[PDB]
Design a protein around this ligand. Structure first.
Ligand code: CLA
Ligand code: CLA
Ligand code: CLA
Ligand code: CLA
Ligand code: CLA
Ligand code: CLA
Ligand code: CLA
Ligand SMILES: CCCCCCCCCCCCCCCC(=O)OC[C@H](COP(=O)(O)OC[C@@H](O)CO)OC(=O)CCCCCCCCCCCCCCC
Ligand SMILES: CC1=C(/C=C/C(C)=C/C=C/C(C)=C/C=C/C=C(C)/C=C/C=C(C)/C=C/C2=C(C)CCCC2(C)C)C(C)(C)CCC1
Ligand SMILES: CC1=C(/C=C/C(C)=C/C=C/C(C)=C/C=C/C=C(C)/C=C/C=C(C)/C=C/C2=C(C)CCCC2(C)C)C(C)(C)CCC1
Ligand SMILES: CC1=C(C/C=C(\C)CCC[C@H](C)CCC[C@H](C)CCCC(C)C)C(=O)c2ccccc2C1=O
Ligand code: SF4
Lengths: 742, 329, 332
């Protein structure tokens, strides 16, 4: 049927009544607290909308309104970052001197001696040095003064206001019906063509008209005050012609397919701008133009109201083959009747995308004066890897929640989903094996090496100077990408990244990017990554495939998604639920990504980053110790953790002291987590009994009876403090180190 | 009719036809008024006025409005007052437009009294002659306003001696006016132009007065079709010719456009289409004011010719059947 | 149009449109807020005023208006006395407090209908359709404005005098420009006012006619001609007022821009040039540096844009007064 706007008017009357009725949304919670378990359950169930109401339409409306809420808080945050840039930063000083001045946009108040944290960051400014790369973003945007940031910040607060109103309006006042929400073809069309396509075209516009000219003048060493305001490039064409002659041709070459007339401001240079060590704005312009066209074309695929276009259901139903029975039949119903099926997908692939972004942004630094800002480089890579890893585990969680709650046998009979359930023992047994194989033939090589080195047998080690394990395939791919410009990418001048090959590119004294040579230490660490990813997948996939049932618990779907166990019987059934697989996958996600960011940190500091002599000799931050040290655990303990922790532990009485405190604080929160993970509810409830006795004895026993946390909450609190403590430790470590050496 | 052909729904009607056209007039005066101030603000005293993208202020400067000698332009106030007057005229016309559309009646069958008062029908050839009549009288008067501006209301700028001059000898004896049927677009003296608009005016009032008192002859009824689509097609044809002639005058004529306020020479080049490109290849930008007014109105004239053809093919009958059943046969 | 129409929170102030008591309360509140702005930002500008460096660029848009009335200035805008500004700031602030108290009275404490409160439409009650009491309201308001014009005439003739840029000093006018042959002359020569006696004589002619208009609008009821042409609806009379204020705003913005006496130039930038890009606006002259944009540029542009949006207010409310429902327009 036809995609159309159809809403109910005034579905939910706006009133503070329910604000004064905590747990109104759940029938069980509505009765009120009897024990302290109620207080936890309130927060635990708050956003679990499927348990509020059965009605999919009411759930869809709650989700749509909540999203306007989350867009509002993210816009408040982004507006705040830009406002702090406008008011409490050395952005204007940093523009004048990017190489010397250190980016800072957080000033601490003088109280209890914490003003020490306002260090000398350059540009006659005292504040906390920021590692979020906002200054490099704003320079890329072509922002050259505090007033432009103020305008952008205020604009953001108005957009955050609009997003709040939208969320209130689209819930309380004009709530779309389920019909509206289930127009997946129209949504994909509008999100591909407008959100991504027109967003990318719009941005190409800004790049071509504002960013490229302003950045070109700044790279030509023109003073920030002397550079014309971005509107002067539109109003005064002559200024723009002088930088990019192609604008002389006007818009006729676009309409007459004489596109070579724009070859000066729409380039395919490759490599990096040698002044800034970032990607060329003219390459970025052409990228966003090319992206925009491909998206606007792509988003005319799905049939809406005019017959032309694909129906996704028919595409899915037609993709079946002799191994997969009914193939992708019934998956359209899964993805259009379950929000959890969509959230699973979108978290899995947005998480995977965020990790791709992490890799692509370090190797091809897109912003001016990012590549040489080693603190920003390390921090944005690590940040986006972490966000990626959490989102992926979220994908798996909501995949398991779908399997328990929203999976229908009738819809999903002899389809790809049904058939994976029927060989899940074959999937998990094989994945179990490949995990053990990778574990032995990746980690076991480190243990072999540690032992050989310890026994004074370096000739018997797995190393470049001993038994070599050269990553020949990755080495071969690096070569192909290095030979690409002029060859298999004829109209490229440089490679996409200097990481693949070409020359050392240097900005100031420092290496922006150079070839990242792969050897035995790179082969070993890559097979550690493969191992730690395959084990995380084993846990999460086992979680999703065995969420509904197993050979142990046939009726696991009836027990639900999040239950602690089915009792000490059958030998003991602790942590069989899909929730408990997510819990265990988080530790393995944490273990996996920890080694990824450690790999990145050490490899970049030893083999890429460093100073460049006038002659052209590169002196690396840790002097290429990775090749010989990163092949033993002792080498990681000594030359990475021990060596590079010197800055964080020696930070007291300086501007980095905060990272020293965060480092210990995080070690504490991590250790605190072991209380929750190693212990059980039974002990704590019995201890609370005695404490409750003493409160009873003095007539201070609370009406809301104290209870030990639930078995599940114990685990949830455990893994929360473990991840917080562990990640925060590395965060403090990375900052204190890279803000000293980088 | 569909949404895209939604303005064809009030084609007949009465009140919305006045409203839609008085709105276009309000918009046209708003363009005339507001972009006067735009061109005043964008006009730099230095650099000759041709390449500054000015297509409105030169028209005022041609009428000898604060110019001086050799287009030096001392006074900007006369341009501002004209800009203000057309802008206030836009406001009252805009108010009058949305009155007749929304507030006023959507039919004039019982409003004014009769077809002579203000009502009209497309088929009836008596009141549409009266409308044409009074419109020719207004155009006739509008031509005599320019004659007024020439004779002693300031005088008009001449490119012969590059100054604002007062004409006091209009070119009578239409032996030269009939002479200018072949010697047109080579007008080199202002007395000939003034005498031209005098001859246009006195005949246009003479045409006007004749169209009101008399009804078209059965010869006219037999030849020309009295249909809203047909009279639109005749108008599209009339404007197309006007546009092509105006485009030619803009290109070749050196007096009616005083050269120093514009580029100066335009050569007719043909590749895929005819177009007046440019002379001296205007650098530091591209295309003079004259080049814009010549080409834009030529292309508009060509598309209005395609408008004549399209609407005239629908004028012979309805042709909404003959386009579809053209191939469905 | 249905009789029991209910408006949302965003159109929530349309709910008391008719009513009676809340209409007084809502407008006495606006008056209290307007006087609070007039009173409190006097002290703001006094505190922010630096004696040295010319007070065009220091963002003073209230104190210059007082300084124009020859109010502790001296010679060549030297500004000797700051105390008279503080007292005016205090007086408008105490007027705000009593108007605020009067506002909250009529809204909460006082009755929500005046049908049986005061006695009749003559006493203090009002109805939109009836053209008899709304003429009385217009009348007494014109009398007050007429008196308020004669206060400025008072300030000119006897109470200190007004500052002139001719000789750059506070001067007392003792020869007001009578003979309205010059007042009709100033229908074209307006915004080029070069002498204070002409301005004083102008406000004298405005005042004596505004009292004369006021007194007439009480004693007589509009002719059936008026009833036939103009519509007596609360939305219609609002639209006429929005139109009236829009014109006032545009005229005031022009006088602020071009006139060099009514704003004595030394307290401001001095020249404002009308440029057009996307909208008409009075940008600035001599490009005021070390901040940006003179006080004159602010008073000119702000009131021009306010005038334009009040014109969009006139259109919106006037289209709703005649009987255009936009809801059925977006439906088909
Ligand atoms: C979205 C996240 C965000 C975060 C984490 C911060 C964090 C901070 N802000 Mg910023 N701020 C933000 C958004 C944010 N802001 C936005 C959107 C605006 C625009 C209105 C501002 C405008 C702003 C100003 C004007 C100031 C701060 C200040 C501060 C600092 C002290 C907070 C405080 O004053 O507590 C006070 C405690 C309470 C309000 C609760 C009692 C702190 C680092 C202060 C600062 O940096 O001082 C040097 C400061 O003066 N912020
Ligand atoms: C402005 C006034 C307002 C009022 C009076 C209401 C009133 C109501 N809302 Mg509505 N709503 C509003 C605005 C409002 N809403 C807005 C702006 C949105 C868009 C998000 C919504 C979207 C919405 C949804 C999706 C739902 C409601 C529901 C309701 C009803 C129950 C809500 C409740 O009791 O929880 C009170 C809760 C709070 C006071 C907590 C607010 C949490 C905010 C939104 C986020 C805070 C983020 C902040 C940065 C903190 C981060 C972490 C911190 C450590 C820093 C109640 C009638 C519910 C309902 O009808 O169920 C029957 C329901 O499901 N509203
Ligand atoms: C867009 C992303 C997204 C969305 C919309 C949802 C939505 C939902 N999730 Mg999913 N989930 C996500 C990402 C998301 N999740 C990710 C990334 C993970 C991996 C961790 C998960 C893993 C997950 C599990 C295991 C479960 C859910 C559940 C749910 C449902 C209930 C959530 C709730 O009530 O929280 C209430 C909120 C709290 C209890 C507070 C959370 C605070 C966290 C633990 C720590 C925050 C620390 C912070 C980062 C640092 C500040 C520290 C400082 C304050 C000291 C709801 C449908 C639950 C469900 O039953 O589904 C039906 C459920 O059991 N999610
Ligand atoms: C250092 C700590 C540590 C170690 C060594 C292990 C080891 C293992 N974990 Mg465990 N895990 C850990 C911490 C650890 N975990 C923690 C803290 C948690 C809580 C979150 C978990 C939760 C967990 C889950 C949820 C899962 C695992 C799984 C695994 C196995 C993965 C398969 C593999 O690599 O086999 C190869 C073995 C090794 C790498 C161990 C060292 C091998 C040595 C170097 C070689 C042998 C030397 C020699 C022959 C010794 C014997 C000789 C002697 C008797 C004389 C592996 C046995 C997964 C699994 O079982 O899938 C297959 C799985 O799904 N673990
Ligand atoms: C450029 C000037 C212009 C002017 C003055 C008008 C004026 C008018 N339009 Mg038109 N319209 C225009 C451009 C214009 N339109 C364009 C460019 C489109 C294509 C999007 C339309 C599509 C359109 C539709 C679909 C309709 C109108 C209608 C109308 C009339 C409104 C009658 C009513 O209120 O019901 C009015 C005469 C209405 C009408 O003609 O009612 C009989 C009507 O239904 N217009
Ligand atoms: C800025 C000055 C201002 C003033 C003086 C008022 C005054 C008033 N408002 Mg309004 N209001 C305002 C701005 C203002 N409002 C704004 C900006 C909004 C949008 C947020 C509203 C939204 C609003 C609503 C929804 C209602 C009022 C109502 C009222 C009346 C209160 C009657 C009562 O107590 O019951 C009173 C006349 C009430 C009313 O009109 O009662 C009949 C009422 O229901 N106001
Ligand atoms: C600015 C316009 C204004 C207008 C038109 C009114 C009109 C009115 N006032 Mg209000 N009043 C106002 C401002 C205004 N007041 C202010 C600023 C204050 C604070 C001093 C008050 C304090 C006030 C009180 C205490 C009373 C009135 C009363 C009245 C009503 C009867 C007056 C009478 O006959 O004795 C009348 C509707 C009387 C009333 O409401 O009668 C029941 C009444 O008792 N007014
Ligand atoms: C891997 C290649 C691959 O996926 O083969 C493709 C094959 C599926 O072939 P089909 O032609 O049946 O696929 C049809 C649809 O599923 C695709 O639209 O997969 C299997 O046989 C099951 C997976 C076993 C994989 C074992 C590891
Ligand atoms: C940063 C930020 C901000 C801002 C932003 C902005 C400012 C934006 C804008 C945006 C934009 C500004 C965009 C736009 C775009 C556009 C587009 C996207 C267009 C398109 C077009 C087209 C598509 C075309 C077509 C066509 C035609 C029409 C005709 C001819 C043919 C063609 C095809 C060419 C704020 C404040 C929010 C806050 C936060 C942050
Ligand atoms: C019906 C219709 C339509 C149409 C309409 C139209 C087209 C309208 C028009 C209208 C208009 C067309 C209007 C106008 C207006 C104007 C104005 C608004 C003006 C103003 C002005 C001013 C404001 C001025 C002032 C000044 C002066 C005079 C001088 C000094 C300076 C100043 C600036 C102050 C449409 C399609 C939409 C839709 C459908 C229906
Ligand atoms: C320590 C521990 C507890 C005990 C911890 C409990 C009961 C948590 C209680 C702590 C909170 C912070 C109590 C908060 C009480 C009041 C709300 C505080 C009011 C005062 C503030 C306003 C300052 C468990 O219950 C448990 C259960 C299952 C597995 C492991 C463990 C576990 O390790
Ligand atoms: S130990 Fe805890 S989780 Fe395990 S079976 Fe017993 S109650 Fe369940």
């Amino acid at each position: 049927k036809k995609a159309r706007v159809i809403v109910d008017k005034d579905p939910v009357p706006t009133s503070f009544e329910k604000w004064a009725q905590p747990g109104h949304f759940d029938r069980t919670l509505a009765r009120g607290p009897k024990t302290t378990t109620w207080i936890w359950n309130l927060h635990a169930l708050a956003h679990d909308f499927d348990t509020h109401t059965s009605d999919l339409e009411d759930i869809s409306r709650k989700i749509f309104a909540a999203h306007f809420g989350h867009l509002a808080v993210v816009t408040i945050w982004l507006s705040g970052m830009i406002f702090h840039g406008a008011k409490f930063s050395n952005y204007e000083a940093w523009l004048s001197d990017p190489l010397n001045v250190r980016p800072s946009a957080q000033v601490v108040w003088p109280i209890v001696g914490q003003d020490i944290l306002n260090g000398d960051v350059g540009g006659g400014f005292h504040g906390i040095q920021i590692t979020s790369g906002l200054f490099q973003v704003w320079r890329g945007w072509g922002i050259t003064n505090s007033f432009q940031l103020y305008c952008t910040a205020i604009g953001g607060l108005v957009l955050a206001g609009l997003f709040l109103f939208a969320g209130w309006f689209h819930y309380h006042k004009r709530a779309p019906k389920l019909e509206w929400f289930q127009n997946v073809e129209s949504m994909l069309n509008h999100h591909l063509q407008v959100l991504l396509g027109c967003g990318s075209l719009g941005w190409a516009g800004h790049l071509i008209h504002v960013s490229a000219p302003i950045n070109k003048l700044m790279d030509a060493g023109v003073a920030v005050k002397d550079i014309p305001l971005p509107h002067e490039f539109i109003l005064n064409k002559s200024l723009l012609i002088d930088l990019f002659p192609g604008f002389a041709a006007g818009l006729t070459p676009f309409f007459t397919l004489n596109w070579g007339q724009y070859a000066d401001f729409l380039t395919f240079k490759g490599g990096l701008n040698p002044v800034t060590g970032g990607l060329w704005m003219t390459d970025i312009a052409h990228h966003h133009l090319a992206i925009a066209v491909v998206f606007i074309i792509a988003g005319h695929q799905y049939r809406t109201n005019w017959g032309i276009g694909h129906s996704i259901k028919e595409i899915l139903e037609n993709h079946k083959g002799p191994f997969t029975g009914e193939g992708h039949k019934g998956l359209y119903e899964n993805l259009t009747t379950s929000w959890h099926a969509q959230l699973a997908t979108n978290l899995a692939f947005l998480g995977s995308l965020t990790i791709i972004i992490a890799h692509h942004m370090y190797a091809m630094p897109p912003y001016p004066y990012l590549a040489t800002d080693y603190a920003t480089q390390l921090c944005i890579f690590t940040h986006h890897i972490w966000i990626g890893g959490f989102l992926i585990v979220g994908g798996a969680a909501h995949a398991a929640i779908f399997m328990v709650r929203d999976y229908d046998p009738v819809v999903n009979q002899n389809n790809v989903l049904d058939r994976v359930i029927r060989h899940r023992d074959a999937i998990i047994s094989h994945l179990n094996w490949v995990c053990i194989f990778l574990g032995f033939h990746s980690f076991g090589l480190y243990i072999h090496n540690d032992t050989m080195r310890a026994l004074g047998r370096p000739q018997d080690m797995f190393s470049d100077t001993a038994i070599q394990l050269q990553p020949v395939f990755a080495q071969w791919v690096q070569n192909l990408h290095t030979l690409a410009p002029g060859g298999t990418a004829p109209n490229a001048l440089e490679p996409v990244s200097y990481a693949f090959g070409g020359g050392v590119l240097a900005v100031g004294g420092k290496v922006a990017m150079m070839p990242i040579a792969l050897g035995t230490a790179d082969f070993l660490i890559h097979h550690i990554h493969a191992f730690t990813i395959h084990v995380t997948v084993l846990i999460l996939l086992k979680g999703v495939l065995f969420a509904r049932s197993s050979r142990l618990i046939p009726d696991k779907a009836n027990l639900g998604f999040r239950f602690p166990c089915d009792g000490p019987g059958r030998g003991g059934t602790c942590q069989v639920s899909g929730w408990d697989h997510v819990f265990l996958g988080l530790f393995w996600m944490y273990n996996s990504l920890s080694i990824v960011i450690f790999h990145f940190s050490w490899k970049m500091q030893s083999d890429v980053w460093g100073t460049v002599d006038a002659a052209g000799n590169v002196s690396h931050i840790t002097g290429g110790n990775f090749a010989q040290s990163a092949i033993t655990i002792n080498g990681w303990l000594r030359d990475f953790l021990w060596a590079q922790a010197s800055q964080v532990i020696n930070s007291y009485g300086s501007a980095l002291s905060a990272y020293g405190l965060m480092f210990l604080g995080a070690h504490f929160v991590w250790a605190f987590s072991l209380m929750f993970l190693f212990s059980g509810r039974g002990y704590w409830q019995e201890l609370i009994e005695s404490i409750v006795w003493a409160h009873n004895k003095l007539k201070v026993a609370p009406a809301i009876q104290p209870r030990a946390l639930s078995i599940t909450q114990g685990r949830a609190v455990g893994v929360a403090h473990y991840l917080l403590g562990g990640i925060a430790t590395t965060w403090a470590f990375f900052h204190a180190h890279i803000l000293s050496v980088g | 009719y569909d949404w895209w052909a939604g303005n064809a729904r009030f084609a007949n009607l009465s009140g919305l036809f006045i409203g839609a056209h008085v709105a276009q007039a309000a918009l046209t005066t708003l363009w005339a008024g507001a972009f006067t101030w735009f061109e005043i603000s964008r006009y730099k005293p230095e650099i000759p006025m041709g390449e500054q993208g000015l297509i409105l202020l030169p028209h005022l400067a041609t009428l000898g409005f604060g110019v001086g000698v050799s287009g030096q332009v001392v006074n900007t106030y006369p341009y501002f007052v004209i800009g203000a007057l057309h802008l206030i005229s836009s406001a009252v016309l805009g108010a009058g437009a949305l009155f007749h559309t929304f507030k006023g009646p959507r039919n004039l069958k019982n409003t004014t009294g009769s077809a002579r008062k203000f009502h009209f029908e497309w088929n009836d050839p008596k009141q549409l002659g009266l409308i044409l009549g009074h419109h020719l009288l207004f155009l006739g008067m509008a031509a005599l306003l320019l004659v007024g501006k020439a004779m002693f209301w300031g005088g008009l700028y001449d490119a012969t001696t590059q100054v604002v001059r007062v004409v006091n000898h209009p070119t009578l004896n239409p032996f030269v006016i009939y002479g200018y049927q072949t010697h047109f677009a080579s007008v080199n003296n202002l007395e000939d132009l003034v005498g031209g608009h005098i001859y246009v005016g006195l005949i246009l009032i003479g045409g006007g007065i004749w169209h009101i008192v008399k009804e078209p002859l059965p010869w006219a009824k037999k030849l020309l079709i009295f249909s809203g689509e047909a009279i639109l097609s005749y108008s599209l044809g009339g404007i197309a010719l006007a546009g092509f002639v105006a485009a030619y005058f803009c290109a070749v004529n050196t007096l009616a456009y005083p050269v120093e306020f514009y580029g100066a020479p335009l050569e007719l080049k043909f590749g895929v289409t005819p177009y007046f490109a440019d002379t001296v290849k205007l650098a530091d930008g591209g295309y003079s004011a004259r080049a814009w007014l010549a080409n834009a109105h030529f292309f508009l004239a060509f598309f209005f010719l395609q408008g004549h053809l399209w609407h005239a093919l629908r004028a012979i009958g309805v042709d909404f059947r003959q386009i579809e059943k053209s191939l469905n046969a």
